[PDB]
């Protein structure tokens, strides 16, 4: 049905405005001040675009976190693909609508996911990947139908949980948690330096995240016929 | 009934108090401190506001934002004028009453919506727009009454709608996102430099955030009928 | 019964620890980031308070708080007495523990609520004013049983409303809204300086707010009967 | 049943990503800016931790509020000892990989909770004990099955109230409230100075606070049958 194209539109503009609000507010440079600011602005954009499409499209507004949802048997194959598609081309496009009204001298890099001279870019993949992996754990948790009247709003506790991910990560990777949030400033920049980190780390955090719920924790223990029949719809 | 008269009264306090506390806490200069600290100031003041009269009124609070529920068809055109009216002058006076009780020097221009040196109207009028769509977007998705029993308090998912509207934007154009609050300012300090940048930017925003909801993430199909009916009461 | 003297207890101790964790945070000077701090750690105070005991006795915390529900006709002129003496005693009590556990050099004036040079008593007293009434307003508000299941945390809100209070008054009076608070410091550093301003405002702001809620935005008609009938219990 | 070792699995993940996020982003030095950084990321942490597993193991990842359920007479002694044994070797672990991934230099001493030169010994564990005690007591009264549909995300209550005694705390002793969050720096820097506060501090504090709450605020009567029948399960 036509409630299957609306959420592809929501991922698409979700995407562009996390993006676009989310490296607009990281332009310049810095120190708490700026890991704060960047932190909270990153995790409120993603709480807000929550509230505001989560009952739409689930919110993914995120490849890897997407992905998580894939192997998590939550959503057919085909409509991963399209959500990551719209997440994609919806980053990108607010990269560009940034561009287009942000002043030079203060684009700088765009907010390009970039390591720290000290930090290998195995160390990096770690990093990424435990930032991934708190992160979908608790879209997971909070996503679950099966608990909690005493949740709260979901859309804020994986925003924080973004927040989180950044307070700590932005010194080592700054923060990337997100392949198309990462893509969107190298595709426009022309610099696709370590850029394998940031779909690496997230993709596995999400695959070790998803599965450590699922098959764990809380074990949503779903027969090999309906997970085909999902992963087909 | 006084079931109108009440809200109009709401919409009038609450305006004062959102334009007193929100210029308060903007005098000064400055950096992520200023921003932070202005962005979370004016977002916990609609918090507050929302959960204060968000029953009585339904906070709107500003002029782009009742200007959405009317071209939303959720307020006749009678109640809209007089919001309007009362967000004009409950500013207004918060402006004035936050004057009287400040010292000079360090009033300033009673932090009235500036743009960037660097920054061409245009390109303001484009952030105006972005900054007030994605506010209205969420103000639009959690007011809808067809959805989420986990959205948590609604009052700040607002707020920190508003917050990160402010992370961003501040930057470019101090961040209207409400033509009231930028008109109290301006209207006390006899400037009306760019001002057409914070009726524009937020206005057109404001609807696009409508449209986009109402037509197209989850249509709220109302017939012509309707329409008039409502637009007239 | 009983129900009335774990009240009064837990008006003591909320009221001990709402000032140690307050003041505690308050020592040192300082600019954004002082302010930030310090507004953040009231507001949270209050917010982890008014879950702690908010279902107990309603976690006033406040003798103006208090003061507001006295005149608003929800509790008696005995429960009211007790309360504030509570709150008075408790306060003092978190100031002396604190005064023994932090370093001299560093203890200051236990942070005593203090004019902005620039700043006249009679400016000061209508900042108060305002700080309480929005303050109590949503306390009002978020309190009434009539309204909302969309409210959210009402702990949060009080709390977030505390700390916008700060944001914005620190800078002229370092922000009392609450008259206990105030009290403490003064009681203790024998500093009684411009004190009236700290029971003034609190006081007719929480009175303008309870006046301006029942009164108006969401009259709750109690018949003279009720009234004195409350006020005796 | 299982529904015992997915709890203590639960604990001891929740426990490694506390301690891994929450030293993590303590790296450095520094001020407002750095204890406002650190207290939320603490909190955000918890507050992230209590959604993923609170339903599942009620998210104690902390020996001294595990201990204050003991006493509270909530959970046997054989739970409580697992617990207590998953969260020491969830946080070495966390510090552990915190360790392999961070470059030296900024390693420092892994965030070791530390007293302040001025602050003695005595008063570092009055500070950890106040610190831990209102943090226990918003623990019980949040966790309480017998209040509020007004709670919202408790979660966010105790991830705050985990704030609020940094953002008071971190000047004292660096504020530990947490005995296996204060020992994974210690055991791996080889560095046990002052760590009898760290752990003397949180029991005590959380045992005023379960005593504070069961006892006297909101009793929770049992007889002495359950109390050994719990113990005992």
Same sequence: chains 1, 2, 3, 4.
């Avoid at 005493?150 to 973004?162: E, M, N, P, Y």
């Avoid at 696709?192 to 940031?198: G, K, P, Q």
């Amino acid at each position: 049905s036509a409630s299957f194209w609306r959420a592809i539109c929501a991922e698409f503009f979700a995407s562009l405005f996390y993006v676009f609000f989310g490296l607009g507010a990281s332009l310049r440079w810095a120190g708490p001040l700026h890991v704060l600011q960047v932190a909270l602005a990153f995790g409120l954009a993603l709480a807000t675009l929550v509230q505001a499409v989560g009952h739409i499209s689930g919110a993914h507004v995120n490849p890897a976190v997407t992905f998580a949802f894939l192997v998590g048997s939550q959503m057919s194959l085909l409509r991963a693909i399209c959500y990551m598609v719209a997440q994609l081309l919806g980053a990108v496009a607010g990269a560009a609508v940034l561009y287009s009204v942000t002043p030079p001298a203060v684009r700088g890099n765009l907010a390009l996911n970039t390591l720290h001279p000290g930090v290998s870019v195995g160390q990096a993949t770690i990093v990424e990947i435990f930032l991934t992996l708190q992160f979908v754990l608790c879209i997971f948790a909070t996503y679950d139908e099966r608990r909690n009247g005493r949740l709260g709003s979901v859309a804020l506790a994986v925003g924080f949980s973004l927040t989180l991910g950044h307070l700590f990560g932005m010194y080592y990777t700054g923060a990337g948690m997100n392949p198309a949030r990462s893509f969107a400033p190298a595709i426009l920049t022309r610099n696709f330096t370590n850029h394998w980190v940031y779909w690496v780390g997230p993709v596995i955090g999400a695959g070790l995240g998803s599965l450590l719920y699922d098959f764990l924790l809380f074990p949503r223990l779903k027969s090999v016929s309906e997970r085909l029949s999902i992963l087909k719809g």
